[PDB]
């Protein structure tokens, strides 16, 4: 019942992000250091320092769009995928998902077929057609089929509507996705597939209500590239990292 536990880990993790310390430790863009080595006091001091550099908070808003740099964040796609990837895969050696090796000319089916049946993997996807970054979680399930789940956030603006990571995880975080559809989505040929096929693959895999009327294929960059990278993880280490972060610490 790894699936049931996974669901609970993800749920308590997401609920804790209303907490200042949890939020800042989760959503930070330093990737060369261990996620769990992040100090929420120091992060807060770094923001204070930056705001001072800018001549105070009301000035800081003027020159950077109006954002209160102390506010808690809900992350854009690259930031959610990069950090949840580190959360899942790290133990005591830092991993920088921005620097790992990506595969550009491999089909997803080809790649998954090479993965150890007894290992958990997470795949980070950098999708140029969509302009989107997201994760595919492939936990090993005992006497069960190879099963895939999506983890993502999206501020919107492309083919897909906006979705917060918290909402995504709450509605679809334990919803298995077709490796078949994923293989089709992730192929080179995806750019040439009919409107209705593209719209339905997208809605089915990436839209929170699986609603094809919520998908705008006119925003696709049909010449965009697809790259992806996979990495094993220890399930208990994942739980352990998330518990720590949720510990409002």
JSON list of N, CA, C and O in Angstrom, two decimals, residues 47-70:
[
{"chain": "A", "resi": 47, "resn": "UNK", "atom": "N", "xyz": [15.68, 37.63, 1.94]},
{"chain": "A", "resi": 47, "resn": "UNK", "atom": "CA", "xyz": [14.64, 38.49, 1.42]},
{"chain": "A", "resi": 47, "resn": "UNK", "atom": "C", "xyz": [14.69, 39.89, 2.08]},
{"chain": "A", "resi": 47, "resn": "UNK", "atom": "O", "xyz": [14.60, 40.91, 1.38]},
{"chain": "A", "resi": 48, "resn": "UNK", "atom": "N", "xyz": [14.84, 39.95, 3.42]},
{"chain": "A", "resi": 48, "resn": "UNK", "atom": "CA", "xyz": [14.94, 41.26, 4.10]},
{"chain": "A", "resi": 48, "resn": "UNK", "atom": "C", "xyz": [16.10, 42.06, 3.48]},
{"chain": "A", "resi": 48, "resn": "UNK", "atom": "O", "xyz": [15.95, 43.21, 3.08]},
{"chain": "A", "resi": 49, "resn": "UNK", "atom": "N", "xyz": [17.26, 41.43, 3.38]},
{"chain": "A", "resi": 49, "resn": "UNK", "atom": "CA", "xyz": [18.42, 42.07, 2.80]},
{"chain": "A", "resi": 49, "resn": "UNK", "atom": "C", "xyz": [18.12, 42.63, 1.41]},
{"chain": "A", "resi": 49, "resn": "UNK", "atom": "O", "xyz": [18.35, 43.82, 1.12]},
{"chain": "A", "resi": 50, "resn": "UNK", "atom": "N", "xyz": [17.57, 41.78, 0.54]},
{"chain": "A", "resi": 50, "resn": "UNK", "atom": "CA", "xyz": [17.22, 42.20, -0.82]},
{"chain": "A", "resi": 50, "resn": "UNK", "atom": "C", "xyz": [16.27, 43.42, -0.81]},
{"chain": "A", "resi": 50, "resn": "UNK", "atom": "O", "xyz": [16.39, 44.36, -1.63]},
{"chain": "A", "resi": 51, "resn": "UNK", "atom": "N", "xyz": [15.30, 43.41, 0.10]},
{"chain": "A", "resi": 51, "resn": "UNK", "atom": "CA", "xyz": [14.31, 44.48, 0.12]},
{"chain": "A", "resi": 51, "resn": "UNK", "atom": "C", "xyz": [15.01, 45.79, 0.53]},
{"chain": "A", "resi": 51, "resn": "UNK", "atom": "O", "xyz": [14.74, 46.86, -0.03]},
{"chain": "A", "resi": 52, "resn": "UNK", "atom": "N", "xyz": [15.93, 45.69, 1.48]},
{"chain": "A", "resi": 52, "resn": "UNK", "atom": "CA", "xyz": [16.73, 46.84, 1.90]},
{"chain": "A", "resi": 52, "resn": "UNK", "atom": "C", "xyz": [17.57, 47.36, 0.75]},
{"chain": "A", "resi": 52, "resn": "UNK", "atom": "O", "xyz": [17.63, 48.56, 0.53]},
{"chain": "A", "resi": 53, "resn": "UNK", "atom": "N", "xyz": [18.24, 46.46, 0.03]},
{"chain": "A", "resi": 53, "resn": "UNK", "atom": "CA", "xyz": [19.01, 46.82, -1.16]},
{"chain": "A", "resi": 53, "resn": "UNK", "atom": "C", "xyz": [18.12, 47.72, -2.01]},
{"chain": "A", "resi": 53, "resn": "UNK", "atom": "O", "xyz": [18.57, 48.73, -2.53]},
{"chain": "A", "resi": 54, "resn": "UNK", "atom": "N", "xyz": [16.84, 47.39, -2.09]},
{"chain": "A", "resi": 54, "resn": "UNK", "atom": "CA", "xyz": [15.93, 48.13, -2.95]},
{"chain": "A", "resi": 54, "resn": "UNK", "atom": "C", "xyz": [15.34, 49.38, -2.33]},
{"chain": "A", "resi": 54, "resn": "UNK", "atom": "O", "xyz": [14.49, 50.01, -2.96]},
{"chain": "A", "resi": 55, "resn": "UNK", "atom": "N", "xyz": [15.78, 49.73, -1.11]},
{"chain": "A", "resi": 55, "resn": "UNK", "atom": "CA", "xyz": [15.35, 50.94, -0.42]},
{"chain": "A", "resi": 55, "resn": "UNK", "atom": "C", "xyz": [13.99, 50.78, 0.21]},
{"chain": "A", "resi": 55, "resn": "UNK", "atom": "O", "xyz": [13.15, 51.67, 0.14]},
{"chain": "A", "resi": 56, "resn": "UNK", "atom": "N", "xyz": [13.76, 49.60, 0.79]},
{"chain": "A", "resi": 56, "resn": "UNK", "atom": "CA", "xyz": [12.51, 49.35, 1.50]},
{"chain": "A", "resi": 56, "resn": "UNK", "atom": "C", "xyz": [11.42, 48.69, 0.68]},
{"chain": "A", "resi": 56, "resn": "UNK", "atom": "O", "xyz": [11.42, 48.72, -0.57]},
{"chain": "A", "resi": 57, "resn": "UNK", "atom": "N", "xyz": [10.48, 48.12, 1.42]},
{"chain": "A", "resi": 57, "resn": "UNK", "atom": "CA", "xyz": [9.41, 47.32, 0.85]},
{"chain": "A", "resi": 57, "resn": "UNK", "atom": "C", "xyz": [8.51, 48.06, -0.14]},
{"chain": "A", "resi": 57, "resn": "UNK", "atom": "O", "xyz": [8.21, 47.50, -1.21]},
{"chain": "A", "resi": 58, "resn": "UNK", "atom": "N", "xyz": [8.08, 49.28, 0.18]},
{"chain": "A", "resi": 58, "resn": "UNK", "atom": "CA", "xyz": [7.15, 49.97, -0.73]},
{"chain": "A", "resi": 58, "resn": "UNK", "atom": "C", "xyz": [7.84, 50.39, -2.05]},
{"chain": "A", "resi": 58, "resn": "UNK", "atom": "O", "xyz": [7.24, 50.30, -3.12]},
{"chain": "A", "resi": 59, "resn": "UNK", "atom": "N", "xyz": [9.13, 50.69, -1.96]},
{"chain": "A", "resi": 59, "resn": "UNK", "atom": "CA", "xyz": [10.01, 50.81, -3.12]},
{"chain": "A", "resi": 59, "resn": "UNK", "atom": "C", "xyz": [10.27, 49.53, -3.90]},
{"chain": "A", "resi": 59, "resn": "UNK", "atom": "O", "xyz": [10.40, 49.56, -5.13]},
{"chain": "A", "resi": 60, "resn": "UNK", "atom": "N", "xyz": [10.42, 48.42, -3.18]},
{"chain": "A", "resi": 60, "resn": "UNK", "atom": "CA", "xyz": [10.66, 47.13, -3.80]},
{"chain": "A", "resi": 60, "resn": "UNK", "atom": "C", "xyz": [9.50, 46.75, -4.72]},
{"chain": "A", "resi": 60, "resn": "UNK", "atom": "O", "xyz": [9.70, 46.23, -5.83]},
{"chain": "A", "resi": 61, "resn": "UNK", "atom": "N", "xyz": [8.28, 47.01, -4.28]},
{"chain": "A", "resi": 61, "resn": "UNK", "atom": "CA", "xyz": [7.11, 46.73, -5.10]},
{"chain": "A", "resi": 61, "resn": "UNK", "atom": "C", "xyz": [7.14, 47.54, -6.41]},
{"chain": "A", "resi": 61, "resn": "UNK", "atom": "O", "xyz": [6.85, 47.02, -7.49]},
{"chain": "A", "resi": 62, "resn": "UNK", "atom": "N", "xyz": [7.51, 48.82, -6.30]},
{"chain": "A", "resi": 62, "resn": "UNK", "atom": "CA", "xyz": [7.53, 49.72, -7.45]},
{"chain": "A", "resi": 62, "resn": "UNK", "atom": "C", "xyz": [8.41, 49.19, -8.56]},
{"chain": "A", "resi": 62, "resn": "UNK", "atom": "O", "xyz": [8.01, 49.22, -9.72]},
{"chain": "A", "resi": 63, "resn": "UNK", "atom": "N", "xyz": [9.58, 48.69, -8.20]},
{"chain": "A", "resi": 63, "resn": "UNK", "atom": "CA", "xyz": [10.60, 48.32, -9.20]},
{"chain": "A", "resi": 63, "resn": "UNK", "atom": "C", "xyz": [10.61, 46.83, -9.63]},
{"chain": "A", "resi": 63, "resn": "UNK", "atom": "O", "xyz": [11.40, 46.45, -10.50]},
{"chain": "A", "resi": 64, "resn": "UNK", "atom": "N", "xyz": [9.71, 46.01, -9.07]},
{"chain": "A", "resi": 64, "resn": "UNK", "atom": "CA", "xyz": [9.61, 44.58, -9.43]},
{"chain": "A", "resi": 64, "resn": "UNK", "atom": "C", "xyz": [8.17, 44.07, -9.66]},
{"chain": "A", "resi": 64, "resn": "UNK", "atom": "O", "xyz": [7.90, 42.86, -9.56]},
{"chain": "A", "resi": 65, "resn": "UNK", "atom": "N", "xyz": [7.25, 44.99, -9.96]},
{"chain": "A", "resi": 65, "resn": "UNK", "atom": "CA", "xyz": [5.92, 44.61, -10.38]},
{"chain": "A", "resi": 65, "resn": "UNK", "atom": "C", "xyz": [4.82, 44.73, -9.35]},
{"chain": "A", "resi": 65, "resn": "UNK", "atom": "O", "xyz": [3.63, 44.70, -9.69]},
{"chain": "A", "resi": 66, "resn": "UNK", "atom": "N", "xyz": [5.20, 44.85, -8.08]},
{"chain": "A", "resi": 66, "resn": "UNK", "atom": "CA", "xyz": [4.22, 44.99, -7.00]},
{"chain": "A", "resi": 66, "resn": "UNK", "atom": "C", "xyz": [4.15, 43.79, -6.07]},
{"chain": "A", "resi": 66, "resn": "UNK", "atom": "O", "xyz": [3.26, 43.70, -5.23]},
{"chain": "A", "resi": 67, "resn": "UNK", "atom": "N", "xyz": [5.09, 42.86, -6.23]},
{"chain": "A", "resi": 67, "resn": "UNK", "atom": "CA", "xyz": [5.05, 41.64, -5.43]},
{"chain": "A", "resi": 67, "resn": "UNK", "atom": "C", "xyz": [5.65, 41.84, -4.04]},
{"chain": "A", "resi": 67, "resn": "UNK", "atom": "O", "xyz": [6.76, 42.36, -3.90]},
{"chain": "A", "resi": 68, "resn": "UNK", "atom": "N", "xyz": [4.90, 41.44, -3.02]},
{"chain": "A", "resi": 68, "resn": "UNK", "atom": "CA", "xyz": [5.45, 41.38, -1.69]},
{"chain": "A", "resi": 68, "resn": "UNK", "atom": "C", "xyz": [6.33, 40.16, -1.61]},
{"chain": "A", "resi": 68, "resn": "UNK", "atom": "O", "xyz": [5.84, 39.04, -1.57]},
{"chain": "A", "resi": 69, "resn": "UNK", "atom": "N", "xyz": [7.65, 40.38, -1.53]},
{"chain": "A", "resi": 69, "resn": "UNK", "atom": "CA", "xyz": [8.62, 39.32, -1.47]},
{"chain": "A", "resi": 69, "resn": "UNK", "atom": "C", "xyz": [8.50, 38.48, -0.19]},
{"chain": "A", "resi": 69, "resn": "UNK", "atom": "O", "xyz": [9.10, 37.43, -0.14]},
{"chain": "A", "resi": 70, "resn": "UNK", "atom": "N", "xyz": [7.75, 38.92, 0.83]},
{"chain": "A", "resi": 70, "resn": "UNK", "atom": "CA", "xyz": [7.56, 38.03, 2.00]},
{"chain": "A", "resi": 70, "resn": "UNK", "atom": "C", "xyz": [6.38, 37.09, 1.91]},
{"chain": "A", "resi": 70, "resn": "UNK", "atom": "O", "xyz": [6.20, 36.23, 2.77]}
]
